[PDB]
Amino acid sequence: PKQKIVIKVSMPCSRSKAMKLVVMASGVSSVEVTGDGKDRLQVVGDGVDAACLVTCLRKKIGHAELVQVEEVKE
């Protein structure tokens, strides 16, 4: 049931912190920085709660928004 979600996050230093917050969440297997602006977190996992992640990233880092959801093709 694996999922790829991408979350755009305002990360102008803090990227460290955002990545730490995501890689610790339940279900998350990996997080890496992607995108032309190096501001999209590409999050891979099983049972990942996007809403929760977006919410925490807003609280702790700055603006966050979910921009891509793709089921992992096996």
Binding site: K2, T34, G35, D36, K38, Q68, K73
Partner: protein, 81 residues
């Protein structure tokens, strides 16, 4: 728009899952806004400007969906796939 002139997306192929076969490039009024990866013969949901779009990929990474006016997302097969 010639995708042969577009620099690769800033991708990260996670080693724990299959490598996606497509590059996608998003444009507003023909100017590139962002780019990434997606699977061929598949589907994704993507935020395209103000709207969520359900984007289908074919076996050659041709992408289809209901894009908002001004916006497009174009696909191409990655080298060697």
């Amino acid at each position: 728009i010639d995708l042969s002139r577009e620099r690769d997306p800033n991708f990260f192929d996670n080693a724990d899952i299959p490598v996606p076969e497509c590059f996608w490039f998003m444009f507003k009024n023909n100017v590139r806004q962002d780019a990434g990866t997606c699977y061929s013969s598949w589907k994704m949901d993507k935020k395209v400007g103000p709207n969520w779009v359900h984007i289908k990929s074919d076996d050659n990474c041709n992408l289809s969906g209901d894009f908002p006016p001004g916006w497009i997302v174009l696909g191409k097969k990655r080298p060697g796939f």
